[PDB]
Amino acid sequence: ENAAPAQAPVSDRAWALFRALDGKGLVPDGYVEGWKKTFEEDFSPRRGAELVARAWTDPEFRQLLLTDGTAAVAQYGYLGPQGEYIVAVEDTPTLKNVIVCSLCSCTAWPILGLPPTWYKSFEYRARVVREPRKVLSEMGTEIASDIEIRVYDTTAETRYMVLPQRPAGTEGWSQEQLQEIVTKDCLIGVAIPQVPT
């Protein structure tokens, strides 16, 4: 009762799916290898970090990013699959934003990178919408009681990025310096950018 079904090893199943389609001429030459390269090298949270650093140092761009995220991202050429309609959400001294896909995994791939395993976990998908404060605490991020937490559930085609607050101690940093502290988890919203001593 309740037992798993018999299954061939997953690698064998996945490659069987490839070979069945490839052997019918349905998969162009180099196709999956091209996607692998896009997913590994192009889709990256370094892009979202570039956008945050620009916003932090350019009020005009900040305004654009917050009002028409698609247009702002397009300036950099970073629209793409799973990242065609972008909304950036602003953290403030009284608001912390956090993103999830409770139904599956949806993520702004081109600017955040493909989601990490933990983001797709049942634990995150079930819990962050109901107890985000405790989830973030457990993960290492304490959000004070004076701060409303707002969870965006990625249920349609909007693809989100968080614009975190800029920490003290970074005044006058270059865009490159600022980018370094905007991590993937800052863009998802579970982390706050950290400044070293």
Binding site: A14, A16, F39, D153, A156
Partner: protein, 212 residues
């Protein structure tokens, strides 16, 4: 579909398996893991055989215990394989022959889907809306925690998309609708049993109605 995939609000899970900024390792942790997404895109863009919506739904159609014990990328191997069989592109026999063993698929759909609603309302930022108190056995992009609940519009998209409940079943009558960022107070969704502030759900126009 009120499946086990509709996890938001479920209680009893443990810690999220991450601490902030920890090493997540490479993008792909096994040499096959780029295949499900790549082959999904082959199906959508190259073959024209199915939509991304149909992929979301076929994963929802995994047998529930099977869903719960299957790693993420494997669910999409299963789902894309299933669609290829259902669409007549591949056979389960050839998949199992190539795999050298069993390759169970998602279960058949129990709904033909439904059309884009004929009667909907264009909402404005600041307006109060209720999520329609409806039950859809097939695909729907409405997590049950918001069914029947009231919130306020934060955004109306400037683009429109096919209605999931139709295109997720390969129907011809998905039309197009904008979606709305609907902000709900945490207490509206979970009463006293929440530690959050607000939750914003991105809801197709056809899931919404004016609040009373």
């Amino acid at each position: 579909m009120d499946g086990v995939h509709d996890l938001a609000g479920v209680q009893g899970f443990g810690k999220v398996p991450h601490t902030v900024n920890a090493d997540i390792g490479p993008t792909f942790h096994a040499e096959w893991e780029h295949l499900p997404y790549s082959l999904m895109f082959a199906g959508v863009a190259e073959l024209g055989a199915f939509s991304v919506d149909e992929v979301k739904y076929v994963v929802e159609r995994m047998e529930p215990r099977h869903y719960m014990m299957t790693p993420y990328y494997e669910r999409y191997v299963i789902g894309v394989a299933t669609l290829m069989v259902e669409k007549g592109i591949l056979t389960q026999d050839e998949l199992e022959s190539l795999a050298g063993g069993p390759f169970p698929l998602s279960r058949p759909s129990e709904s033909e889907g439904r059309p884009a609603p004929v009667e909907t309302t264009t909402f404005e930022v600041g307006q109060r809306v209720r999520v329609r108190d409806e039950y859809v056995p097939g695909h729907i992009r409405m997590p049950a925690y918001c069914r029947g609940r009231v919130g306020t519009i934060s955004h109306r998209t400037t683009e429109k998309w096919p209605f999931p409940d139709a295109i997720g079943h390969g129907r011809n009558d998905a039309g197009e609708e904008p979606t709305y960022h609907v902000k709900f107070a945490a207490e509206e969704l979970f009463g006293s049993d929440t530690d959050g502030g607000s939750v914003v759900v991105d809801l197709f126009e056809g899931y919404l109605e004016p609040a009373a």
